[PDB]
């Protein structure tokens, strides 16, 4: 609570998960995952990995409560996939954040 920022929405990338069943599952379900991230200001982290880790957890936690509010649930596959794409977005956010303030 408090201290968070919301990144701008990002184009959803084509993501390949390495097997036939997951690629299809992802293509069909990817709309259920965030297209923007919540994070704390980049200055508050010792490096990229630290920022990213927290950005991922914060974003997924908040997305999960809003999803629960709608009466929906994430499976273990959902969490694994969401983790991956949110990680990509957090990396992009850090790079942009790191560039600013530098």
């Amino acid at each position, epitope marked *: 609570l408090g201290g968070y920022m919301l990144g701008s929405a990002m184009s959803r990338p084509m993501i*390949h*998960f*390495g*097997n*036939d*069943w*997951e*690629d299809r599952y992802y293509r069909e379900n990817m709309y259920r995952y965030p297209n923007q991230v919540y994070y704390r200001p980049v200055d508050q982290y010792s490096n990229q990995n630290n920022f990213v880790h927290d950005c991922v957890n914060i974003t997924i936690k908040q997305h999960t409560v809003v999803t629960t509010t709608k009466g929906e649930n994430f499976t273990e596959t959902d969490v694994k996939m969401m983790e*991956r794409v949110v*990680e*990509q977005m957090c*990396v992009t956010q850090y790079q942009k954040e790191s560039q600013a303030y530098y």
Partner: antibody, heavy 119, light 108 residues
Framework: QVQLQQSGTELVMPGASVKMSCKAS????????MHWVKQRPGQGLEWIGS????????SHNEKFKGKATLTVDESSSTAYMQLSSLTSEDSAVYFC????????????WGQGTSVTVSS | DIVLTQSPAILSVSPGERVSFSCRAS??????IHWYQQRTNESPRLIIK???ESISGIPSRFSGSGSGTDFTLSINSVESEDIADYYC?????????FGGGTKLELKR
């Protein structure tokens, strides 16, 4: 023409680690998954693990998780597998291979790196 | 884990003969089975993908059929260069798994 270049051989001491390279050429490196497959002398193929070069997301055969570390170097279009704490059980040929675009037949194969673990 | 069982483990064949061998999966994998040929001291080579789809530069004598759990690779007319080990592999879900292989040898 797609090529996957692997070193021919590695001689490794028991307990040591080895890092094997697989250098890709002839296509857009980040568009395709790369895979690593083990074959013991006179035995069959065993999947070790695979990597998506776009973000270095990986998947492992459960028994290689903690043993085989997969990375890529996007700038040199090279995939690496590091095997640690080698024993004679690790004496084998290791192939890298590349699948299709959103399809997972292993379309291209390296020539394999033959690893011998011995003191 | 999806277990892939190949049979027979060894097949003796006469040049020119039509041969087939089978790969059976412990669970339904749709058409997510691929076949590889591996000659002595060589890398495997993709021969048929997704049960039945042909591969560029592979002889038309190779074909595959099946969907679900029971798959077959057939060679219309066996040639000496086809003497090799043959493996199936599934890519439907993790972990990838391989059959134990079928070895082709010449009957004499």
């Amino acid at each position: 023409q797609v090529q996957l270049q692997q070193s021919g051989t590695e001689l490794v001491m028991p307990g040591a680690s080895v890092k094997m390279s697989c250098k890709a050429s002839g296509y857009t490196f980040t568009d395709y998954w790369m895979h690593w497959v083990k074959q013991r002398p006179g035995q069959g193929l065993e999947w070790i693990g695979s990597i998506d070069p776009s973000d270095s997301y990986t998947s492992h055969n459960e028994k290689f998780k903690g043993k085989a570390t997969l990375t890529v170097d996007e700038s040199s279009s090279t995939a690496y597998m590091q095997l640690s704490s080698l024993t004679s059980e690790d004496s084998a040929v290791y192939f890298c291979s590349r699948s299709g675009y959103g399809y997972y037949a292993m379309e291209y194969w390296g020539q394999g790196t033959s690893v011998t673990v011995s003191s | 884990d999806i277990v892939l069982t190949q049979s027979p483990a060894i097949l003796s064949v006469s040049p020119g003969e039509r041969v087939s061998f089978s790969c059976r999966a412990s669970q339904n994998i749709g058409t997510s089975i691929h076949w590889y040929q591996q000659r002595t001291n060589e890398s495997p080579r993709l021969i048929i993908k997704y049960a039945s789809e042909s591969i560029s530069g592979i002889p038309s004598r190779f074909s595959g059929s099946g969907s679900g759990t029971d798959f077959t690779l057939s060679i219309n007319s066996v040639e000496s260069e086809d003497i090799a080990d043959y493996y199936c592999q599934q890519s439907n879900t993790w972990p990838y798994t391989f059959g134990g292989g079928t070895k082709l040898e010449l009957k004499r």
